[PDB]
Amino acid sequence: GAPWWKSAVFYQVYPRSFKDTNGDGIGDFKGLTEKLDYLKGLGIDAIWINPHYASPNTDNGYDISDYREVMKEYGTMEDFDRLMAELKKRGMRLMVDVVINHSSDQHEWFKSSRASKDNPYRDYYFWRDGKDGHEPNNYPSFFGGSAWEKDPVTGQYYLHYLGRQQPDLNWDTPKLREELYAMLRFWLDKGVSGMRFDTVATYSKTPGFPDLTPEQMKNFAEAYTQGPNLHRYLQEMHEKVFDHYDAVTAGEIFGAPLNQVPLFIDSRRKELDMAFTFDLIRYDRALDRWHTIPRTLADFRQTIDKVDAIAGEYGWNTFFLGNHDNPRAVSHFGDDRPQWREASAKALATVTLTQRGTPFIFQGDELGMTNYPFKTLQDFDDIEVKGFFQDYVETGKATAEELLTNVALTSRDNARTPFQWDDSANAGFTTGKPWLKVNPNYTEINAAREIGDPKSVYSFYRNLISIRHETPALSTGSYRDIDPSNADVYAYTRSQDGETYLVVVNFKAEPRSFTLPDGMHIAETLIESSSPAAPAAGAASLELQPWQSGIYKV
Template sequence: MSQPSSSNSSAPFLTTLRASEANTPDRRRWWKEAVVYQVYTRSFCDSDGDGIGDLPGLISRLDYLQSLGVQVIWLAPHYDSPNVDNGYDIRDYRKVDPLQGTMKDFDRLVEGLNARGMKLIVDIVANHTSDQHAWFRQSRASRENPYRDFYIWRDGRDGGPPNNYLSIFGGSAWQKDETTGQYYLHYFAREQPDLNWENPAVRKEMYEMMRFWMDRGVAGFRLDAICFLSKLPDLRDLTLAEMESLEHVYVTGPKVHDYLQDMHREVFAGRDLLTVGEAFGVPFDETPAFVEESRGEMTMVFHFEIVRLGRHDWQVQDWTIKDLKAVLRGEDTSSGPEGWLTSFLENHDNPRSVSWFGDPSPKGHGPSAKALATMLLMRRGTPYIYQGQEIGMTNIRFDGIEDFEDINARGIWDNTVGIGKMSAKEVLSSLSKISRDNARTPMQWDGTSRAGFTTGVPWFRINPNHTDINVAQQEADPGSILNYYRRLIELRATHQALIYGTFEDVDPDHPSVIAFTRTLEDEQFLVLINMCGEKEHYILPHGLKIAEVLIDSTSAQAADVLPELMPWQAGVYRLAPPADI
């Protein structure tokens, strides 16, 4: 490994830009200080033996989540759904999916969280519904139906779709409906028709639905595909270049900010809510418009440049630690002086971080999972932990397309292998690494045959490594990944600088070590992460000296942290003031 570049040898104490007034303890917000835990209910815990996770199963695990130290639970869609896209195709926004439980169960969940001093946010899918939703059933009944304009309908062109839009899931974004002879728009699966946000009646219905859940105790929303609400004027054809980056095109509708500001005025204003938008396709330099407090839109957004690093759409590409650090720097400044950030490495739509960024082998699994936990929780922004991430759950093996449940993976297969465009081996190699199914395997509670997830037949395969990677085993091990997460969460809560402090990459050119500071007033901490499986001889940038170890994944003391970093070693260290250097 090479040594740090001399061009980054100066990092004087407390000379970095201060956090803006909007992001200091003077402007505290509970959602800036919270750590959020995402529950993909279907795979979390099954209470009745039908093999599908449910709300009573989640309720039975609330003590565990409280012990982890998280303050907020983000619940995946819990609404009535045909489950074509595992709940993101909603049939009834005001009804709990019978597979997940009842409204009484939902109320018990809120009560259980409140009793533990915790909060609940829920997924809102505002861009589309299920094609089985009552609105769409009415909309497709005739061209004159009062609900016709709830969705986007167009006549075909030259015997085909109205334009050349492609679905995010592959194929045309238009589906012909034989009843009326017109096509409806669907950015995702054909069973997920897009709502027409130009129609005030649609907006009114959606706002009333959101108020309905707030009245039941919800403290905020994760807003799915929210930046896709506004469609391009006249639904023009896309250029070839635009068709290569659909997500970047579909977020450029001219009224997206009008809709979000209207939503804020009608629903969010006057309430201290966490509202986090899925900003897939939104570039960093356009982010402030979505999250600056004075604009009244959302409190924060999810960017995907980090979790999609090394990917072009679904195809795997090479990436480097320097590439990762460049994205970390870009994302840190993306929110502007008034906005706030998120920090995440996993969710229900992306592979397991240990398998993507770390080393899932027996030797590297624990050390690399702790290194990634350090990066996740010590960055600036609200951290989001995905279920199982806290024990280092990994990707699962796929031997053929029949092993996939993911509608997106199957669509990719049909549009490549299915038409003879690519070989099965080539496509399977990438899909195995990036499929959403990797994140949707059942939670690994213990080493029994069904991993403590269910007493029945699980809806999806349990990862065979659950016998070695599970909650029960790690609870009993003080040095486990799980207990390291607990210590990191407690550390973040203890020091305001680790929440509100500025972020500075103090060694951007180093090829394997991530080194950044968190600074607030007279406190400065250094976060060091060796992102490789080899020992690294590392010299701190000039002007920095470790005074105290706050946490270290190898239990190192201040005197022996450097110059030798162990494989995947990570830690947080208090820096000495200039007079002590």
């Protein structure tokens, strides 16, 4: 019998934008804890929360200044415990975000580290001499300018792949690794059911920090995942920590080449249980990460196929169409125009809940929430956008207008707009002023209107989730794409123990025909979206309306 997490449905909560209960315009623990019935009624088994630790919030939780206290905005340790207690009451599990590629520069380790060259915490981080009057090498940072930042106190530079205020932690130092393990135990001893490892692939640094080649320079993300001790560190963590608990582990394997993913998730390797990969969510993103490249369904399905293949027999994939780091699912993979939004958010739901892997639903997608209509660069909270302005506008590579028009479609802030609960002031997210503006379409896209309506996107999510739970083939069954070259109609089977299901999803806003594989016939129709009528028992083909989806037993 396969583990519980292979057949669970996860939901991702970005606490900052989920539910505010005290008017500061920032979501919090009490807010999440109040919405657990909503989550439970949806069908959700397990929730992954974004970072909830003490932080200066230069990168909204991903710069942690104390790994053993909760973030002051979210509430208190007691609130957190209540959150756990309430989830347990409902038979739900918590996965937390674990952010140990870097800490905050306000962490006490970094404060001590930077204080002098000879202190017990110097090697908890990377400090290095400049070269030829400048940085130690040509590493760029994700968040703009150099990955190296000079400290006048010592004259040395420290490494930061992320923002200046997120110094990278030095995993080559045994005492630092040991501290990380003791920290992971402090959370696991409290009964957390899962841990999601932020940028898990960049823990290992290249010895000698040589320069990146001009090639490696255009794809720095990948270069940062090539550290030679990476897998030895992941194995040690497992042996010293995960072996002693029963929590599931999942890595954000950002920037790694797809062929290396099995090293992280082959269960025989005793590293991680599940992979978040980014081949799909970035399949139409340019190497600079702010332009987009036109792709088709054929690219979409071929990427999924490849990613499926690498899980193999002993590895396991999560599956996701959206997260706090990417544009909104229906906007990016669907068609969010008002006449197609609901139909294509339904079709993407069918995709999400029939993939082989553990699906993760990002807060708000079950309502068909969309990208935000940003109007000026000042509308972005996102430090990644500030970084693009620094790297591309101030250098004369692009104008402010070219940045705006492109990052409007790609920016993480599209995912971070407050969750749309009802059509009251600010979608009922807060009674104060939201930290990031609510999307005006809230008057038409809100949980209250959606739950009341059997034909809504929400109701469709709920129904799909019930179907998935009832049908083991749809979680753990094999996956086979009927026709990978087809750019109109996505279609594939899921099979387990003699039972085979067929999923067919029209990606065109026009009617289309689908012909079943020779000798395959529709036995039953489990569900359809945007269909006027189910096929007949024995059908050898299908007619599809714009954006129609369906799951059929064959």
